[PDB]
Every structure is written in structure tokens, then in C-alpha cells.
Design a protein around this ligand. Structure first.
Ligand SMILES: Nc1ncnc2c1ncn2[C@@H]1O[C@H](COP(=O)(O)OP(=O)(O)O)[C@@H](O)[C@H]1O
Ligand SMILES: Nc1ncnc2c1ncn2[C@@H]1O[C@H](COP(=O)(O)OP(=O)(O)O)[C@@H](O)[C@H]1O
Ligand SMILES: [Mg+2]
Ligand SMILES: [Mg+2]
Lengths: 23, 445, 445
């Protein structure tokens, strides 16, 4: 994965697992 | 009024019963101490009676009054009139055990009231103390109040009771359908067979030369214990920050190369594995990590107690490593510091009924021997560590010293000391790519 | 009348500062809750302000008064008179965070006093509870105080937060990999790759046997940091006078032989080079040298703070060396003195958010080992240095011990401990003529 793909995957992981306090 | 909780009748009854029946001293001596009496005359009488009883003399009325008179302390007690009144007024047919328990109980409650008053007074006049200092003071006071009562249950037990407990333990060993594990599951089959897991109330030492995979193996044990159990697992790490611990844990659980994680060069399958691992970890949620530096045994014990209070018990405690812990009052001598650390860890393990796994280092001279596998004598500066540990496991990788080694990827766990079993070497597979130890699948001689 | 602890002025300051400046609200919100305020009106005011801030409305005087008047609660607070008093007395020079911390502190003290009163009143009235029940009740009440509190930056955190921090760090590293030119530049490509520069808030130790080139390497690092940045670079040279350091720096920057400068045998081109170097240095003006001897950690911290205040920050701090520093209160024990020095240096590094490099010496026994490359244990009497340092580098030159060495002119920087990265050996070229280290252009294994 490149930069954008890795960022999208990480964002999807965060959305699936919640943890809204990271931002 | 704010009455001080006490009961004179129980004390007078106890003293009268002791005067009348000298054979009951023991039944009173195991339930109450001299300092447990509320009035000065009663404490003085009890002290004199203890002196007479342990000097081999009768404790009748005339001898006790005369002996108090000889030391000039008879008038302070109340006189021969008061001693005779104590002897006469209290009936012989009494249950002195209940009275001794009552005297024991009032002392504890009164001391609790005293500590509460001291806490309030300290709160009103902090004298430069922070909230943390006040909390430390309160915890120390309540701990001094509560701890050490347990010596009543500790002592010479009856042979029948110990035999019955042993029979219960053996029959529970027989009846259990597990595969040889009675304690916390280590996650490795051969080590489980040889050790029956990590036993509660035992001191466990993990030792290796630097860069042998000591922290990696310990983290693998932690992950296996977390996966195969339900009780919380607590980690104290003076060596690495919690973020690196979590990165290693992700590499171990997801089976993804650690270099890729460090450099960010991951692929789709690795991302899927990491997602699955994160989902499992967030589903379980039973691992706690404390990466503070410069820990002292008091801090470790306090935080472990806080965790056990919060979650009703611990399943395993892991410390990495004990060579970084500090005891400020014994900083002058390192050997005494290590001995105090080991004793406090063993006491904590016994108290909380949990396995405690502490990591430790060995001496450098070991690398100058013909054979570099550790022995007990290789724990120099740490004799108390060898003396107090219930289990001692050394990690040995042959490829670390020899590039020609035929044992690449193979690690040896060497049992230097086993309190309740055999000793020897167990082989495992080392995958440094994922920072993991696994069961050895090769042939076993 | 025993007044329980409170301070109306601090509460009034918090409310007034929130009234005058609404952008500070978050700082107050993270430090205080509505239950920490002693008077009912102050709690009501803070609750109304919290609700208004949540709804998105401003919380200035007029808006707050209008909102209170709508709900009919203006009379309970004290009126627009009291609101105007709060507005008037509080100045706009408000450090609301400190006042909020003070409010928090009073609340903790109040709760501790109340819990002590409850425990004592329970002691006077057992109501059938046993001693174990009373002790458990007291322990639970006292322990509940520390629940949560500020155990985020002062204790174990939540696993999800640590995992998110790891993910964010991986994102930051992978998005823009510049190969060690993101933190403080070290001036060496391989050292930048292995260490990612000299990280702020990190303690860095440089160690070697005498005459290996510790001072030379440290000065080269200082020169590289000064040339590749704009912030001041501060040197604490307890080993050499500033004149010799400046002569070495001139030799390094102008690439003139150090012996020629020391003996004055310079030709016209060398004089031109030295003049150019001096001109560049006087144009930059970002190097500060302090050659005092016997410095305590307090003086070092004070002078570093003074420099950071005067010139708006620091980029690197260098100390040479820590075996010459003094702690008079611990002069009897060398280990305690070194531990105190390392602790204070780490605290200073964390406070000023700067890399702190401290030089150290090794024991003679290293020259007796089969392999003379330095190791951590060669830091005898300085275990705390190994414990507290974020980065540890050893300087080794093979040509010092072997005249017929094949590695002449090649020095090794061995990373014995890195807290946030890998470890290994970095090879550099040693030009002793110019007192310089340079990047190794030879083949790399
Ligand atoms: N990404 C990796 N690839 C291969 N080996 C690694 C990796 N990370 C760590 N290791 C190995 O782990 C060993 C030591 O790790 P660790 O257990 O954390 O330290 P210690 O053994 O001192 O406790 C080193 O010998 C190293 O070879
Ligand atoms: N003019 C010079 N020519 C060659 N080498 C030099 C010269 N001056 C200093 N050196 C080298 O510098 C090394 C030590 O320098 P320095 O780092 O200042 O002292 P230390 O290593 O004790 O901190 C010596 O080993 C020496 O070989
Ligand atoms: Mg380790
Ligand atoms: Mg020098």
C-alpha cells in the first residue's frame, strides 16, 4: 500500500473500532 | 459523647478467669496482647501475668498482688482490694474466648478511629503536602492498621487438616481434565508439561544475556496468558515505553515482520492480520501496562493493590526488569537492594496468590566460559535471587554466539532452579521476524 | 469553629477569567468539574457555563446573565450584582489553569476529610459489622479517592490510546521518511539513518576510554548541529578551556592541521581559511561555551533555562564531562552522585524539550578483555547512566590498540542503548590532523 491507501485503511480501522478520542 | 469503644466487663472477666484457671493462659494468649487492653491498670496486670507465666510461676491472686507490690506497681493497678474484687466478682463458669475476641476487636476499631482522626487533622493542616502526599499517608496508615492480622491463621496447623488439604489437592489433580496445566497456561506445550504452568504465589526469574530475546519471550508469555485466561495481566516495564511494547505485541499476535512495522512497509495481508489482532485485543481488554521509570517496590505494590481493588484480583504479574528497580533506603549496597526487592516481590506473590514473573540479567563473565549456558552460580551479586525464586528459566540462543550454528531459530529454556519439579532444557522455535516464540515442531530425542 | 478548607478568591478568579476570556474554557474544563466548587452559586454558574459552551453560545457576562434570567435562576447565584463583582475583580492577566488545579486540590482535601469523618463515625457505631467489615469499608472509601483522578500522564493509560498513539507515530514516520533529517541533524548520514537525529527531550551519553576522541566527536556533533540549525547550541566544558575548544573548532571548520594552529605555524592560505571561518562564526553567533569546572546540576539547569529564555529556545546541550560535575551533599558516595546527576539531566532534557548530550569515561578493565570494543558494563559505578539515558554511544578506534590495524583512520560509534530506535555500529573516518570525524565513504557491510 502507498501513503493514501495506508491512510484509508487506518481510517477504516479507526472507524470500525471507534476510538474517537484519538483525534 | 464521642465514646472510646471499650468494654471493661470482658477484660475483668478475662483477668478473673486467668486468676481462677491458670491452664487457660494459652487460650487467651493467642487472641489478645497486652497493648490490646484499654485501661492502664489492665495492661499492667496482663504484662505482669505474662511475666509470671513465662517465668514458670503460678498466677494466683496472692502471688500476683505480691509480685506487683515488689516492683512498686501495686498501687497503680488499684490495690489488693481491687485484685480480690476482680478474682471474686467474675464467675468461674465463663467463656473467656469470646471475651478475648471482644478485647481484640475493640483495639482494632479504636485504632481505626485513631487513624481516621489523624487523617482528618493532617488534612486540615497540610503543612506543604500535596494531595499525593496525603493519599500516601492515608494508604500507609490504613495498611499499617490492616496488614499482619493474617499471622493468626499462619502457624503450626493440625496434621489432619494439612493431610486433608493435601488429599484434596491430589484428588483435584486427578479429577481435572486439563493437559497437565494447574496454574497459568504458558502457551507452550513442553514447558506446560514440565512446569504445569506458572504457579501462583511463586517467584519466577527469567534470565538471559543481553539481546537474547528475554523481553520478547516474556511478552510472548504475557500474550499467551492473556489469550488463554480471563483474569487481568499486569506489566511493569522500566525498560521500554508502552508504545514499543504494543508494537511488539502487534507483531507477535498478527505474525507481521517487525521491521515492516517499524518502517511502515506493510501489505494487505499484514494489515488484515493487524486488524484482526486489534479486534481481538479490544474484545478481550485484560492487559494493563505501566511503563514508568525508576520504580520502587512500594510503588509497584501500591499500583498492584490498586489494580486488584479495581478489578477484583490478578492472574499474573510481570516485571521487566528487576535490575532497574530502586530501593532508596538501601541505595548504598546493591546486594542488599536486590535482596529487599526479591523479598518484597516474593511476599507480594504470596499475598495476592498470583504468579509473579520478574526478568533479570546475568554476569558478563559467563560469555568467557567454554560453554555459555547459564548456571546458578552465574547469578553473581544476586544470591538472594537464587535463594528466593521458585522457578528460574534461562534463555539461550546458539546463533547469537556462533554464525555457524545448526540451531538457527531454535532457543533453549534452561531450568536452573525448580522448587517443585525436575530441571532441564526445553527447545522452542524463535521467529525474530515476528518477535515470537513458538512450540518446537522438530523431532524430540 | 474549625473552618474546613476552602478559598473563595480562587473560585472567583476561575469564574471571572472564564467570563473575560472564553477561549481558555477547555483548559478549565480539563482541570475542574462542577462538584469541585465549594459554594452552591459557583457550582450553578459553572454548570450553566458548561451547558452554554456545549450549545455553542458564548459565555460572556451579558449572555450568561440573559441565559440565567430566562430560567429564573439568577436569584440563586446572587444576582447581576455578584456577576458584575466577578467580572470586575478578576483581571485579564489570568493563568486559569493554575487556579483550576488549586480548586481540584481543595476538592481532594475536602473528600479526604469527609471520608475520615465517615470512617470514624462508623467506628463509633458498628451496627453489627465485624472488624474485617469495618477495615474493608475504610479501605474502599480511602481507595475510591484515587480512582481516575489524573492517572493519564501520571500512571498507566488506556490501551486504546496507546494503540492510537502507535498508529499515529507509524503514520508520521512512514508519510515523510527523510532518513534522519527531521529532528536535530547530527551531520552524519549513517548516524541520522540509525538515530533519526538527536531527539528533543532525550538524554544522550557518549562514552570512551581516554584519548579515543570523545571530546573531538562531541565537538564535531556540536559544530554540525550549530551549522545545520538556527537555535543556540550550549556547551558545558568541564574538561578544557574555551580557547582550546575554539582552536579545535577552527581547525575542524577550516580544515587546517591542529598542531599548526597550536604551534602557530600557519601559512597565508591557512590564515585566510581561519579568517573566513571566524567571519562565518561571527555571522552566525549561535554557539555558547561555558568552561567552568565543578558545576552542580542546579547551576547547569539554571543556566540552560536562562539561555532558553533569553534566546527563545535551545537546539542542543552538551556537557563534557559528567565525571567532573559535583554534588556536595552526596560527595561520599560516587554512585549516588552520578544517579542524581543523571536524574537531573534527564529532568532538564524533558523540561526544555532539547537533546542533552553528556560525555563519560570507562574503566581500565576494558583494556584487559579479549575484545576491547566498549560495552555497557564498562560504565562501572554508573548504572543510573545506563538506566536514564535515551541514547548511549561508545567510541572505539582499533588503531589505538593495534599499530598494524587494517582499519586505520576508521572509528566506530556503537549504540549500546537506543530508547526509540535500533542499535548497531556506525563507521566514520577520523582525521586527527583537523580534529574531525567525517562520513565513511568505504564499503558497508
Ligand atoms: N525486527 C527484529 N528482527 C529480528 N530480531 C529482532 C527484531 N527485534 C528484536 N529482535 C531480537 O530481540 C532480541 C532482544 O530483544 P528483547 O527481548 O527486547 O531484549 P532483551 O533480550 O534484552 O530483553 C535481540 O537479540 C534481537 O535479535
Ligand atoms: N593534532 C592532532 N593530530 C592528530 N590527532 C590528534 C591531534 N589532537 C588530538 N588528536 C587526537 O584526539 C584524541 C583525543 O581527543 P579528545 O576527544 O579531545 O580527548 P578525549 O578523547 O579524552 O575526550 C587523541 O586520541 C588524539 O589522537
Ligand atoms: Mg529486552
Ligand atoms: Mg577529551
Amino acid at each position: 500500500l502507498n501513503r493514501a491507501q495506508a491512510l484509508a485503511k487506518i481510517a477504516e480501522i479507526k472507524a470500525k473500532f471507534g476510538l474517537k478520542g484519538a483525534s | 459523647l464521642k465514646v472510646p469503644p471499650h468494654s471493661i466487663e470482658a477484660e475483668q472477666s478475662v483477668l478473673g478467669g486467668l486468676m481462677l484457671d491458670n491452664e487457660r493462659w494459652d487460650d487467651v494468649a493467642e487472641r489478645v496482647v497486652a497493648d490490646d487492653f484499654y485501661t492502664r491498670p489492665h495492661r499492667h496486670i496482663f504484662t505482669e501475668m505474662a511475666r509470671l507465666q513465662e517465668s514458670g510461676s503460678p498466677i494466683d491472686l496472692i502471688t500476683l498482688a505480691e509480685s506487683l507490690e515488689r516492683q512498686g506497681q501495686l498501687d497503680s493497678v488499684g490495690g489488693f482490694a481491687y485484685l480480690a474484687e476482680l478474682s471474686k466478682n467474675t464467675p468461674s463458669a465463663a467463656n473467656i474466648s469470646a471475651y478475648a475476641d471482644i478485647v481484640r476487636e475493640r483495639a482494632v476499631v479504636r485504632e481505626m478511629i485513631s487513624v481516621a482522626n489523624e487523617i482528618a487533622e493532617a488534612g486540615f493542616d497540610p503543612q506543604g503536602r500535596t494531595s499525593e502526599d496525603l493519599l500516601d499517608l492515608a494508604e500507609s496508615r490504613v495498611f499499617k492498621i490492616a496488614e499482619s492480622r493474617a499471622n493468626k491463621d499462619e502457624g503450626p496447623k493440625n496434621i489432619a487438616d494439612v493431610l486433608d488439604a493435601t488429599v484434596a489437592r491430589i484428588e483435584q489433580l486427578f479429577q481435572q481434565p486439563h493437559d497437565g496445566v494447574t496454574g497459568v497456561n504458558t502457551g507452550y506445550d513442553d514447558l506446560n508439561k514440565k512446569t504445569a504452568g506458572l504457579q501462583p504465589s511463586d517467584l519466577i526469574i527469567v534470565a538471559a544475556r543481553p539481546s537474547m530475546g528475554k523481553t520478547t519471550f516474556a511478552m510472548n508469555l504475557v500474550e499467551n496468558a492473556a489469550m488463554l485466561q480471563d483474569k487481568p495481566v499486569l506489566i511493569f516495564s522500566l525498560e521500554m515505553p508502552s508504545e514499543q511494547i504494543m508494537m511488539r505485541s502487534l507483531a507477535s499476535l498478527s505474525r507481521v515482520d517487525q521491521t515492516k512495522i517499524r518502517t511502515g512497509q506493510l501489505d494487505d495481508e499484514d494489515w488484515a492480520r493487524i486488524s484482526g489482532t486489534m479486534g481481538i485485543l479490544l474484545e478481550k481488554r485484560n492487559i494493563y501496562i505501566d511503563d514508568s521509570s525508576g520504580l520502587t517496590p512500594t510503588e509497584v505494590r501500591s499500583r498492584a493493590r490498586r489494580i486488584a481493588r479495581e478489578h477484583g484480583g490478578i492472574g499474573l504479574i510481570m516485571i521487566d526488569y528487576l535490575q532497574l528497580m530502586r530501593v532508596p533506603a538501601l541505595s548504598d549496597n546493591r546486594t542488599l537492594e536486590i535482596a529487599e526487592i526479591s523479598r518484597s516481590l516474593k511476599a507480594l506473590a504470596k499475598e495476592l496468590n498470583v504468579p509473579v514473573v520478574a526478568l533479570s540479567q546475568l554476569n558478563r563473565s559467563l560469555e568467557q566460559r567454554a560453554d555459555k549456558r547459564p548456571v546458578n552460580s552465574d547469578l553473581r551479586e544476586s544470591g538472594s535471587i537464587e535463594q528466593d525464586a521458585d522457578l528460574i528459566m534461562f534463555i539461550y540462543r546458539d546463533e547469537v554466539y556462533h554464525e555457524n550454528s545448526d540451531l538457527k531459530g531454535i532457543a533453549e529454556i534452561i531450568i536452573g532452579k525448580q522448587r517443585n519439579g525436575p530441571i532441564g532444557t526445553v527447545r522452542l522455535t524463535f521467529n525474530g521476524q515476528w518477535s515470537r516464540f513458538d512450540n518446537y515442531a522438530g523431532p524430540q530425542y
